[model samples]
Target chain A: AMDPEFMREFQRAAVRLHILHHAADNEVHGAWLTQELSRHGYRVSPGTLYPTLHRLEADGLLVSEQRVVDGRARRVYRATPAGRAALTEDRRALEELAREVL
Target chain B: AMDPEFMREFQRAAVRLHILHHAADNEVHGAWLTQELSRHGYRVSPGTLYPTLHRLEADGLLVSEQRVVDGRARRVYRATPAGRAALTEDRRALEELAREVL
Candidate 1:
């Protein structure tokens, strides 16, 4: 069984992603994302965010495209069709849970 | 100050959500989600998913509207604008990291 705290953190991270970007591929890096999440009090680090991204890609929930910007090769990611579907499902499940608990 | 393992688990959970459902109003309970996740080799429980859903709602990443279906009162959830934005940001950050590591 998954730990509750781990599950909470996982849910928070997913919700935070939805809160910060709306399916646009603006190509923000880890540092910028960490800062943004930090502003919201999540305080993520590269070590944390990077591996999560890899896992998402591995799971096919996210798709990536690489490009060069200002001489730096960057890989940008967006939610896949599957990814989007999962997000929708989670939101419904989570919301119903909220009503049940609240 | 977050553990690496905790962060990995968190990331896995988020990605799984995206793979399972898109942004829709369909309602599925914790049992279904847990079973789906378990099929993917990530075993989860109601105690874990329920509290996580509560936290997501508290963070405003999910919105809920309730209705009666077959004489049973049920609540459905959707991702808010903020939640969508966050998902976009996380995907980008994660992709760049994936390229670097892979």
Candidate 2:
């Protein structure tokens, strides 16, 4: 049997790109993406959400700031110039793959 | 970093499903799928492809035949009742995901 683990990776990519899409459209937070992805039928948890977000920043695909909300730490994520550029590219690729695979 | 080994797996699924698709459409063999998947931009090799085919047969998802052509061995693969049903299900899921993922 083959692994469909890509189901995980692809969904993770979907979430990564989803984050950029959200961040570009407006500010996004972990809670927002986690809930949103689950709603979209993609499993998004901190397991990947946090790791991917950190990489997004390290890779300059996103910019982050901390906002204190209701006495809790909320990390606000937004698309940087580079992040937006990467999102555009990733979006195009995902869309293309969907076309071919579908 | 998150493993997009799913890319490999996703492509693997594509190839697995692709093999079943071909077997359903016509008789298929390793040579056929190796070339066809490559044509579709998926790099498929004997390693996973052969192992996967074996499992598909063991799982009752496929049945196989040995055809010696031109003094060489060629394994013929065909979809079974269960394989065809599973392929139908897998196909539906992939198409649906493409709709959503796209």
Candidate 3:
């Protein structure tokens, strides 16, 4: 059995990445993320999203570049080498489990 | 951009859940999980898996029952109501992103 607390955090973390992975081609802002997640019924507060983003960047799963767009600085993210490796691991695990159990 | 650190943890957590979600009907133990994940190239040590299991039970994502089998104590886990709810939310989010981006 997985730890419930860790599992919750884990799921939250996964959901966040899955969202970013889908938007790999575009620069996404916190507001855009919050809005999209909310539309899917994920109540991600700015307080939570920003901190998680900072941590993800620190871990090297993502790379960020800042640009001026629409009169504001937008920090755009793309999956890094490390991020891609992790995603591959995740997908491989999921695919196997899906085949065996789901 | 999401923080790199959070993204790593997030992906790890999600992979773990996806494994569990596929095995919802079976009573699973730590050893079974470790072996399965290892085969998929995830290096989950017992030290990491046990604490995570405790936390997951605490959070209500899973339920555990202890039974004596073959003169030994075995703890088995099943996903709980809350776990299923969370899984649904996670899946919905992933499906949306996959459809939009991938």
Candidate 4:
């Protein structure tokens, strides 16, 4: 019903929320995060997700750690305090928005 | 926190949904519609809103009529059948997206 431009915007919002939701308390790896997002209807790849993760980190909503396991390094992500605040605010705003708009 | 780009996207979605929801059952004028959107936290001036109304009309989701009210000509808007479908679909999508993301 909506133009692709409209739907794509919501898709981006959902993807942002998914990442924020996941890193709330967990240190999430790229492979694990990408796979878990599928249950939420997001079909993300490393190509799509790695950049998002870095952006979120750059925004200070998320932080990451790199660990060497079996001589290989992997990055894991977790929500920062700022990330949690932003997520909570967005969730609260959604309820208000739904009542007023939806 | 998100950059202005991300928040702007959600703001647009909310505005579109607000229009669809109102015009679902009643006709709306630009002034009334712009004022009503304030409750949703959108600061829409007529300069901003009139164009959006025109865009929605051009997209075939809404239709308008001109009537003399109190001896002044005013344009009133209502959701078309297509608008109703778009609203319903967007509503369903929001629910799914919320469950998956928020």
Candidate 5:
């Protein structure tokens, strides 16, 4: 297992960046996003993941819409132009940082 | 400048990992580490970097020795074997995450 503390410290921003990258191209829901993140070895709880989506929307990086899924309304998120712009720079930085670290 | 909040949340762990990467191969002191981080676009203050180094040492990820340089004593750090092991995993995670995000 990965170190829990290291996971907590390092994975948050990367996860957010991941969300932005996906949402930039597709509308994403919380449950689906959580599963995608888990696929990447990030065990994000709803408590953590939902709040991050909310924060991203609040920061104007994403926008949410109410959609009826299985007869229930759920929030679906998509990245804004601003969010895509931010992801461009963040991705650049992430790649540069990875090159230096690895 | 990058967003202050973004930098604070994201860069902390990466900086520590970076210190481990360098110290794994060479003896490192704070001043040089700060300059190295700056070259990578990280603006780390001594307050932040020193505490991180202390915490790494305290966690047994690093060990430091006091040595005389220019007739003044300074703490120099190197990664423990355990730290090197941790970096291998971290680098793997970082690269995998980068591939997914980018």
Candidate 6:
């Protein structure tokens, strides 16, 4: 059995990285992000997911806009240049860490 | 520039994984673990590293013993069976994530 607290923290870090990775390549919205996370075996609740999105945006790693799609206002997000750069570095760091950890 | 908070959290998570990875293969002490972390690009403080080690042991992922080396008492740690199992699962998770994130 995994340590619950450690898993919680580790999962959050992984989730943040995943969001940055996806948004760097694609425009993403909440539902899409949620689904993608689930596909990746992360079960993130809206409470956790939405705040993270806002935080990422607030941190300038992501930029968001409200757009009308199908007559409904939807918030869409994409990685900023900084976000992409951060992902580049993060991928490098993650790869180095994985080489030893895995 | 990277978000300071995110990097801090992410680095901590990576450090924990590194500790488990090393302990799974070799008995380790604080200085050795710190040096290994630095070699892998993590700059962890003693304040952070020692507490994390204690927490991991408290969670049953590691066990520690005191040994005399060169007439000086040193505390050493190694991963328990549970720790090894956790590392196996964690590696699987991390690889799966890297596939998508990288």
Candidate DockQ values, in order, are 0.06, 0.19, 0.24, 0.46, 0.56, 0.59
Docking class of 5: medium
* Chain B TM-score, all predictions listed: 0.70, 0.84, 0.80, 0.92, 0.89, 0.93
Ten contiguous residues minimizing lDDT sum, candidate 5 chain A: A1-10
Q: What ranges in model 4 sit over 4 Å off?
A: A1-3, B1-6, B68-71, B99-102
- Candidate 4, residues A2-102, lDDT tens digits: the string is 64445666777767777888899578898998888887677788898889889888988899998998999988799998888878777665666665554
Model 3: what TM-score for its first chain?
Answer: 0.71
Tell me the tens digit of each residue's lDDT in model 5 across B18-100.
Answer: 88899998999999999998987788989889988998888788999999889999999999887888788888877887887
Model 6 chain A: worst 10 consecutive residues (lDDT sum) = A1-10
Write one digit per residue (lDDT tens) for candidate 6, span B18-93.
Answer: 8889998899999889888888878888888999999999989999999999999999999999999888877777
Count backbone clashes in candidate 1. 27
Ranking by TM-score: 6, 5, 4, 2, 3, 1
**Number of residue pairs clashing in candidate 3, backbone atoms closer than 3 angstroms, sequence gap of 3 or more or interchain:** 25
Compute the lDDT of residue B56 as modeled in candidate 6. 93
Estimated TM-score per prediction? 0.43, 0.70, 0.58, 0.86, 0.89, 0.90
Lowest summed lDDT window (length 10), candidate 5 chain B: B1-10
lDDT of 4 by residue, B3-97 (tens): 44356667777787888789887999889998899865788889988998998899888899999989899999999988888888888777766
For model 3 chain B, the run of ten residues with the poorest summed lDDT: B93-102
lDDT of 2 by residue, A27-76 (tens): 88877888987887776667878887887788777789998989988889
Question: What's the lDDT for residue B96 in model 3?
Answer: 48
**lDDT per residue as tens, model 1, B1-102:** 112333344545553344224333344555566675566445467777667666655666556667788999876666676555554554444343233222
Interface RMSD of each: 14.6, 5.5, 6.8, 2.4, 2.2, 1.8
Clashes of 2: 1
> What are the chain A TM-scores of the candidates, in order?
0.72, 0.80, 0.71, 0.87, 0.86, 0.90
Please provide, for model 6 over A22-97, each residue's C-alpha lDDT reduced to its tens digit, 9 standing for 90 to 100. 8988999988999999998899888889999999999899999999989999899999998988787777766776
